[PDB]
Design an enzyme around this catalytic site. Structure first.
Site, mmCIF file in Angstrom:
data_model
loop_
_atom_site.group_PDB
_atom_site.id
_atom_site.type_symbol
_atom_site.label_atom_id
_atom_site.label_comp_id
_atom_site.label_asym_id
_atom_site.label_seq_id
_atom_site.Cartn_x
_atom_site.Cartn_y
_atom_site.Cartn_z
ATOM 1 C CD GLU B 64 -2.559 -1.198 2.704
ATOM 2 O OE1 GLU B 64 -2.129 -1.008 3.860
ATOM 3 O OE2 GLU B 64 -3.776 -1.294 2.443
ATOM 4 C CG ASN B 199 -4.001 -6.411 18.184
ATOM 5 O OD1 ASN B 199 -4.141 -6.461 16.964
ATOM 6 N ND2 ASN B 199 -3.036 -5.713 18.767
ATOM 7 C CD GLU B 247 24.536 -17.417 25.696
ATOM 8 O OE1 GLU B 247 25.271 -17.886 24.800
ATOM 9 O OE2 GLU B 247 24.625 -17.745 26.896
HETATM 10 N N1 LIG Z 1 -0.298 -3.226 15.614
HETATM 11 C C1 LIG Z 1 -0.902 -2.585 14.622
HETATM 12 N N2 LIG Z 1 -1.993 -3.146 13.998
HETATM 13 C C2 LIG Z 1 -2.614 -2.493 12.988
HETATM 14 C C3 LIG Z 1 -2.168 -1.251 12.553
HETATM 15 N N3 LIG Z 1 -2.964 -0.814 11.539
HETATM 16 C C4 LIG Z 1 -3.879 -1.787 11.340
HETATM 17 N N4 LIG Z 1 -3.688 -2.824 12.212
HETATM 18 C C5 LIG Z 1 -4.509 -4.045 12.318
HETATM 19 O O1 LIG Z 1 -3.708 -5.209 12.323
HETATM 20 C C6 LIG Z 1 -4.294 -6.212 11.518
HETATM 21 C C7 LIG Z 1 -3.188 -6.873 10.723
HETATM 22 O O2 LIG Z 1 -2.654 -5.922 9.831
HETATM 23 P P1 LIG Z 1 -2.113 -6.397 8.396
HETATM 24 O O3 LIG Z 1 -2.235 -7.893 8.291
HETATM 25 O O4 LIG Z 1 -0.668 -5.973 8.310
HETATM 26 O O5 LIG Z 1 -3.044 -5.671 7.299
HETATM 27 P P2 LIG Z 1 -2.500 -5.112 5.885
HETATM 28 O O6 LIG Z 1 -1.023 -5.312 5.669
HETATM 29 O O7 LIG Z 1 -2.887 -3.662 5.743
HETATM 30 O O8 LIG Z 1 -3.296 -5.939 4.765
HETATM 31 P P3 LIG Z 1 -2.839 -5.797 3.232
HETATM 32 O O9 LIG Z 1 -2.010 -4.545 3.078
HETATM 33 O O10 LIG Z 1 -4.032 -5.737 2.320
HETATM 34 O O11 LIG Z 1 -2.035 -7.011 2.855
HETATM 35 C C8 LIG Z 1 -5.286 -5.541 10.588
HETATM 36 O O12 LIG Z 1 -6.511 -6.234 10.596
HETATM 37 C C9 LIG Z 1 -5.472 -4.147 11.146
HETATM 38 O O13 LIG Z 1 -6.798 -3.962 11.587
HETATM 39 C C10 LIG Z 1 -1.068 -0.693 13.182
HETATM 40 O O14 LIG Z 1 -0.664 0.400 12.815
HETATM 41 N N5 LIG Z 1 -0.437 -1.356 14.213
HETATM 42 MG MG LIG Z 2 -3.283 -3.134 3.784
#
Ligand SMILES: Nc1nc2c(ncn2[C@@H]2O[C@H](COP(=O)(O)OP(=O)(O)OP(=O)(O)O)[C@@H](O)[C@H]2O)c(=O)[nH]1
Ligand SMILES: [Mg+2]
Ligand SMILES: Nc1nc2c(ncn2[C@@H]2O[C@H](COP(=O)(O)OP(=O)(O)OP(=O)(O)O)[C@@H](O)[C@H]2O)c(=O)[nH]1
Ligand SMILES: Nc1nc2c(ncn2[C@@H]2O[C@H](COP(=O)(O)OP(=O)(O)O)[C@@H](O)[C@H]2O)c(=O)[nH]1
Ligand SMILES: Nc1nc2c(ncn2[C@@H]2O[C@H](COP(=O)(O)OP(=O)(O)O)[C@@H](O)[C@H]2O)c(=O)[nH]1
Ligand SMILES: [Mg+2]
Lengths: 51, 433, 36, 428, 426, 426
Positions: B64, B199, B247
């Site tokens: 993205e 989460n 380690e």
């Molecule tokens: N820890 C964390 N989680 C996030 C953040 N933004 C979104 N998420 C949530 O974490 C989940 C996993 O994120 P990703 O699997 O990386 O989603 P993604 O990479 O945008 O998916 P694609 O780009 O379409 O492949 C998502 O369902 C989001 O709701 C963030 O900034 N930090």
């Molecule tokens: Mg995405």
């Protein structure tokens, strides 16, 4: 490096780091008390914009 | 002269790294643009150029362009090398087959080109340090190709990933169980260790331990920032007893297929609450085995601990921790496994943790990072496997994955792969007489 | 005209959001409407 | 760097998009000539999504306006934001159709779509990486449904793996606006299921029921309705325009929440809607917004969801809000209402977070929802069609100039097949 | 933090509740524009018990204004504090009840309950952990009694644990306001006995008797009459909003109120209520209250406690007063008047002391009289029922709506059963 | 290193607790910020700075009472984690506090006791304070202690059980919660004390001379009782006596863990000018039955055992003429198998002067802890009041409809019947 373990490591290093930890935390209690004032004036800004 | 390379992939991975890289700059005294305000502690996460510029050793990749732009045009513009900070062409859009076959394929060659150009500047390299997710397409499918290519291009380098697991009760993506099953073929034998950060930890630790209500992801990622800084500081800050990365690997992991530890950062306390009690070594070690402080939504009383690795930071004396371990071993509730009677480590670093401006953590004299390998993470898949087969039984949301080139039979191949992995934790939880 | 159609059913922004800005002692002055 | 192509059709699609081009212009700070009078650097970085550049400063829309009657072609140009479009993009027929689905599809439809296909390939060649296509139209008229159908009939020939979002005004449940709307709908729906990737239904008096009970404005014109539906239009396509901690563009907003490649008919909806009288009385937070998001009275389709079951829903959020409590309360929606959700997908709700809200609103959201309750519209409009086809009524303006009744029979069979598949997946 | 929501139904109910919402705002320091103006923090404290926070410091009176007549709705909304009420909680109809209990129950009663229970649910989901429900109405008024009767048979199944109260205006033992009362009272009290956890019987005449001599006011219009019942309401719920040493909320009350789950019709009463020519002498202190609580002339419902026995009488106090001065001046009572007091319950007294008083008065109390004698008021309306009912005076209005005379006998039998249980337990 | 956990559950627990932690600060020299303006190991647990958070777990199930404790002057003092709040009251009902709002909060408070018990390495016992009035102070504590007995147990479960008065009461189901908690006290309580506060209602206007006394006055005098028994631990003494040394010299048999205590020099300022305080005299005057806080007449209740705290300028010769004077005065009751039956409690440190509190600057604070057979009379009247309701089953429905069962009332009789017989056959 050997009087540390009867003395100076304690009461000159632990009690002075702890002296820091006391005064150092007071900035965080002062800084966070400013960011809470951000939200309460933001809501006034979202109240007059809603009004 | 020893260093650790990091790669951060996915929207989840890139923003938890922005909290990682804000902490790295504020730990070593490095400005948000690169130059020192005016050692060798920089040479683990930072490369020193002709000027004072410290180019970061990470490479941020995501498909993205939207999430990569605010770090391209943010306050870390001058820090990152603008060709390291690589973008995508089109969104993976929550699809494993998209991130593995059709649209993540046109970025493997450029990502691996930058890992080669970064690893040759390296001289004492210890291992990789991965950052991805399990929900989206590029957090799951694009990292799957990364583990495919890094296993054959590098081999003996010890890779570690800080995964963010799909939450058992709340969830944000519908087809994320599909993405969290097919990734398991490539995190089992293509990953040396795999940290799970669900989460549900900062979902309620930020509510009960910290007096702040309504947390958001910029507070989720700081705790993930703190733990990685705690682990690598033994490579990075001197100590009475240090734990190298190699380690740490052979000691915590029992078996080649059992490398899925839990996590715990104990002294997570607010500024207005921290002066109300003393934070001793024994107290902060007793507060880390509690079932309301672990990083994954799983009750450790159901399972038995295999081996636990503890990393302490700052002002810690190595007699109180030995008194703490003996006091916490003699309690019956925390039960270990019989074939590992010791089951413990200690690790000492002299430098106490920093707190970022605006953070809700309070800085401490001593911080312990508890990294436990449990068989209670066997039921981490139990609420995901039942989450999986209910959707899979009637071919729901399958036409997209088979529409992008992925074969149907690779769904059931990952199904039986996790079923065998669940059988391993039933095999090791049985006592032998 | 601060907005496009004064009196929308959804919302009409009749304030210049440029003047809508807050700051900390140690931070930069950023606007509220526009945000990350 | 990716973009979606807008394209309107008919009198309804022209008026809906004209207000949509007017509600996103202030969002991106565009005056009624094209210059950028904005105040934010993240309002111009994704201007390539829904706008494109001209000879300096001037930002011209990328919408083609096909409209077989010119009497509402000059209505969009003479409006406040009508000079923004480039004039040679406008394409129109010399004579109107007359609300025949076949006449806008077969005989004078083919006279225009050669030029309409010519101008969409001209603009899409200039785009760097196309993400999807966009349509707005209505099912109840020949110039909207028939012309919209013939565009989709061969745009999948040249763009097979590009997503399509279409915002279709589904015909009226209670009081209808044309007597041949059963015929125009049932052939459009037959042709809207096999080629469109993702569609929306817009009940007309759901807008009227919103403007009566929720908004409570005494004299609402179509401009008030057009602004309300376009607010939902902008909420759909926001995540690929502004950043967030969890964003969902159109490709993500479809391929993870359509279970099967022919069920893509959704419930749209805009979350924050307040009357004048009750506006100081409502707090602005996430728990009160969701009680307005999921209730039947604040919906864009007149059919309630209490008669069916939700399969997948999507809720895109705009503004800073701590979304950990969004996941907390949305679970409370899952637990409090379990019989209205399908049990074979335990994960029914979806989130997306946009960093900036719409200008001035503290926080806003848009509701996207797939339900089996769509059946009570389609099962009746099939009954409306069968009550008129078996009597050979209003048919010689379709059979007498276009297709035979065999296309009508397979249109009923495709609807009735779609009738059975929703029912059999309602209980699974 | 625990909270309640008002359910004011009918012309009788809406006027009482609005005057109640008037007094609540005065004690919590709120203006018609909802903005907080209290000179301290106790006026906020637990403001969630009555008021829901809105933008700009605004506090809406969590209450749905159910009725079937626009005219009552117009009067309350155009009142001095009528603006503070939420317009979405003004659910009302146009076809009147005609003082017929059935018309406010099945024709338009049963067609508007779905809408009212929708906005009843609105308050319940919004509030976090509620304590109960409150509903002002009459007994002889068709939309007041009847619609209120169908609510208390609908919210009770929705929220059983939340103890729900009615300040039901029990009809006069003398001059009748309509001709319809014995029908409407009997039918509703047949459901009042098995719906509400504590019903507060309100006679207009004994409430007049306050303004006769206790206030000795010359021409009491309905303003202070509503203000009078509102005073008892405010002090009953005092342990949920205001700090108090003996905090006995409605939850602490009702488990000491009801000795057997059929008897919950206990006559309320305020206590330092006096006149303009007696405030010059009266000394605000504990013993001179007990004088004017346990008097047989301060009862809101008529049903004098001479013709009954005190089951478990209670009084919720307000103001800074000794707790060893109360104990004595609440035990000296039993030791004296021993007959009324049922020896079966050895000490039938609830000392419920609140720290802060109503603003404008120092030493206060709200005496909820749990005498038995309420069955005489019930046997009074039973005789007025059967005298009209047996001759079939006017019931074709009921039976045409499906309200046949069969359920009229059931209403009489269940309330005569309720006469018996109060009479047997004395 | 001789430490204690001061658990305070219910209202009357924490209200005594505030009056407790007031004078606890004065004697240990601690400001409400926890800092000094080790005797404070027993309470006031060490923190990093000069702050000391009190060794206590303030538990309440109702939001309000714990809240002004929280937002009081001891807001820094009282740590928020040991300040456990609740939302739903126990409705002065044993069943609610023990079952309905029991396991809801018992999980957090066992953790909260345990967390301070980790710092509490070599502790003596648990100072638990509760009434016999309602489930916050009746039912939750019965759940608390049985959890505390199975986990820790050997630690002294020394309980300040506030007893219901022979005549006055806040409640009417007061006999119910009392007769339930008293019989559960038998299986899990080590040296459970008795606080009847009805002679407290009398000696307030005699020894304190406070006419119109209020709850505060009582709790302050109760807090001095807790101070005098524990000052032995914290401070020093010629014959200072441990909490273990109290219990295994005082309680003769495991079902006799119910003594009566009273402050001996309760003399206030107006008498203190004319009072010749001589250690022998005051403890002689202590034994006089008008002064013992537990109303049940010790004058007939045989002195099965007797402990005597001796606080202030107390001299070993002068406490032996004290023993001898009581001995020769044969009219004071004695047991027939302990010849002496005394426990001398010499403590050098004089009692504190609470600010404004009427207890004058008396140099000595001799106290007295005698296990009498008189407690059977207090049990019998409590048992009698329960029988009158439970004969014809009044108010049982609230209790049994909230997680409890009718046989518990019947078994509370049999366990009480054993309890009077423990204090009768000896
Ligand atoms: N820890 C964390 N989680 C996030 C953040 N933004 C979104 N998420 C949530 O974490 C989940 C996993 O994120 P990703 O699997 O990386 O989603 P993604 O990479 O945008 O998916 P694609 O780009 O379409 O492949 C998502 O369902 C989001 O709701 C963030 O900034 N930090
Ligand atoms: Mg995405
Ligand atoms: N506050 C207080 N109460 C006392 C005292 N002495 C006896 N009591 C009685 O102890 C009871 C204390 O109530 P609790 O044990 O907390 O049970 P409760 O009635 O449910 O009280 P709440 O928690 O406020 O609902 C009161 O009913 C008093 O009658 C005293 O000195 N102070
Ligand atoms: N909301 C809305 N609906 C419209 C508007 N114009 C037409 N419609 C609807 O479109 C349907 C038929 O329109 P039609 O004449 O076929 O327009 P055409 O498709 O361009 O030919 C009717 O049911 C109208 O309710 C408009 O401006 N706004
Ligand atoms: N304070 C007060 N009491 C009222 C008012 N109106 C009626 N009442 C009482 O309610 C009774 C009439 O009740 P009813 O007509 O059945 O109520 P309705 O159903 O709302 O019409 C009278 O006897 C009065 O005692 C009012 O405006 N204020
Ligand atoms: Mg309480």
């Amino acid at each position: 490096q050997f009087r540390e373990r009867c003395q100076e490591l304690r009461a000159e290093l632990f009690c002075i780091h702890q002296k820091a930890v006391c005064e150092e935390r007071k900035a965080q209690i002062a800084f966070n008390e400013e960011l809470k004032r951000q939200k309460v004036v933001e809501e006034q800004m979202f109240s007059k914009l809603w009004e | 002269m020893r260093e650790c390379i990091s790669v951060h992939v996915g929207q989840a991975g890139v923003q938890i790294g922005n909290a990682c890289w804000e902490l790295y700059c504020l730990e070593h005294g490095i400005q948000p643009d690169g130059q020192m305000p005016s050692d060798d502690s920089f040479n683990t996460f930072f490369s020193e150029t002709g000027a004072g510029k410290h180019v970061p050793r990470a490479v941020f990749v995501d498909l993205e362009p939207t999430v990569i732009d605010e770090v391209r045009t943010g306050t870390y513009r001058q820090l990152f090398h603008p060709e390291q900070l690589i973008t995508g062409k089109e969104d993976a859009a929550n699809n494993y087959a998209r991130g593995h076959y059709t649209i993540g394929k046109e970025l493997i060659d450029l990502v691996l080109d930058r890992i080669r150009k970064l690893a040759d500047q390296c001289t004492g390299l210890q291992g990789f340090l991965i950052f991805h997710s399990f929900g989206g397409g590029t957090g799951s499918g694009f990292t799957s190709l990364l583990m495919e290519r890094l296993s054959v291009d590098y081999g003996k380098k010890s890779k570690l990933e800080f995964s963010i697991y799909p939450a058992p009760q709340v969830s944000t993506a519908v087809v994320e169980p599909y993405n969290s099953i097919l990734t398991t073929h490539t995190t089992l034998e293509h990953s040396d260790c795999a940290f799970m950060v669900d989460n549900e930890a900062i979902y309620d630790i930020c509510r009960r331990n910290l007096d702040i209500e309504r947390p958001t992801y910029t507070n989720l990622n700081r705790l993930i920032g703190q733990i990685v800084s705690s682990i690598t500081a033994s490579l990075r800050f001197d100590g009475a007893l240090n734990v190298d990365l190699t380690e740490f690997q052979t000691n915590l992991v029992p078996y080649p297929r059992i490398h899925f530890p839990l996590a715990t950062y104990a002294p997570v306390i607010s500024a207005e609450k921290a002066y109300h009690e003393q934070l001793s070594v024994a107290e902060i070690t007793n507060a880390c085995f509690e079932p309301a402080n672990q990083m994954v939504k799983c009750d450790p009383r159901h399972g038995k601990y295999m081996a636990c690795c503890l990393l302490y930071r700052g002002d810690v004396v190595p007699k109180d921790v030995n008194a703490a371990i003996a006091t916490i071993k003699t309690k019956r509730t925390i039960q270990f496994v019989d074939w590992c009677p010791t089951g413990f480590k200690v690790g000492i670093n002299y430098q106490p943790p920093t707190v970022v401006p605006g953070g809700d953590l309070a800085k401490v004299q001593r911080a312990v990072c508890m990294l436990s390998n449990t068989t209670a993470i066997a039921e981490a898949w139990a609420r995901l496997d039942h989450k999986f087969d209910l959707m899979y039984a009637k071919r729901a949301f399958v036409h997209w994955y088979v529409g992008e080139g992925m074969e149907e039979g690779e769904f059931s191949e990952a199904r039986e792969d996790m079923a065998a992995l669940e059988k391993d934790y039933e095999e090791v939880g049985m006592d032998s007489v | 005209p601060p907005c496009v159609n004064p009196g929308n059913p959804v919302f009409s922004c009749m304030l210049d959001p440029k003047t809508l800005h807050t700051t900390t002692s140690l931070s930069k002055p950023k606007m509220i409407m526009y945000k990350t | 760097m990716r973009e979606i192509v807008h394209l309107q059709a008919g009198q309804c699609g022209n008026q809906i998009g004209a207000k949509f081009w007017e509600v996103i212009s202030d969002e991106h700070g565009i005056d009624p000539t094209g210059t950028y009078h904005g105040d934010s650097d993240l309002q111009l970085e994704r201007i390539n999504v829904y706008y494109n550049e001209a000879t300096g400063g001037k930002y011209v829309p990328r919408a083609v306006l096909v409209d077989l009657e010119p009497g509402t072609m000059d209505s969009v140009r003479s409006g406040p934001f009508g000079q923004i479009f480039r004039p040679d993009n406008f394409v129109f027929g010399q004579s109107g159709a007359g609300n025949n689905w076949a006449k806008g599809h077969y005989t004078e439809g083919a006279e225009l779509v050669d030029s309409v296909l010519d101008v969409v390939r001209k603009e899409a060649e200039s785009c760097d990486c196309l993400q999807g296509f966009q349509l707005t139209h209505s099912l109840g008229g020949g110039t909207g449904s028939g012309m919209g159908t013939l565009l989709i009939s061969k745009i999948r020939e040249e763009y097979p793996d590009r997503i399509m979002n279409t915002f279709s005004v589904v015909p009226s449940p209670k009081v209808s606006d044309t007597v041949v709307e059963p015929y125009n709908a049932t052939l459009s729906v037959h042709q809207l299921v096999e080629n469109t990737d993702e569609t929306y239904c817009i009940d007309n008096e759901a807008l009227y029921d919103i403007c009566f009970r929720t908004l409570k404005l005494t004299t609402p014109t179509y401009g008030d309705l057009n602004h309300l539906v376009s607010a939902t239009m902008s909420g759909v396509t926001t995540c690929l325009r502004f950043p967030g901690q969890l964003n969902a563009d159109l490709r993500k907003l479809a391929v993870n929440m359509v279970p099967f490649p022919r069920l893509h008919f959704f419930m749209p909806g805009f979350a924050p809607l307040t009357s004048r009288g009750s506006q100081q009385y409502r707090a602005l937070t996430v728990p009160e917004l969701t009680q307005q998001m999921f209730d039947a009275k604040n919906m864009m389709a007149a059919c309630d969801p209490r008669h069916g079951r939700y399969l997948t829903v999507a809720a895109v959020f705009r503004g800073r809000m701590s979304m950990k409590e969004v996941d907390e309360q949305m679970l409370n929606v899952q637990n409090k209402n379990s019989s209205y959700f399908v049990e074979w997908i335990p994960n029914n709700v979806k989130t997306a977070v946009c960093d900036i809200p719409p200008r001035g609103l503290k926080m806003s959201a848009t509701f996207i929802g797939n339900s089996t309750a769509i059946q009570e519209l389609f099962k009746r409009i099939s009954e409306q069609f069968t009550a008129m086809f078996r009597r050979k009524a209003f048919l010689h303006w379709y059979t007498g100039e276009g297709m035979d009744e065999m296309e009508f029979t397979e249109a009923e069979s495709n609807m009735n097949d779609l009738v059975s598949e929703y029912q059999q997946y309602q209980d699974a």
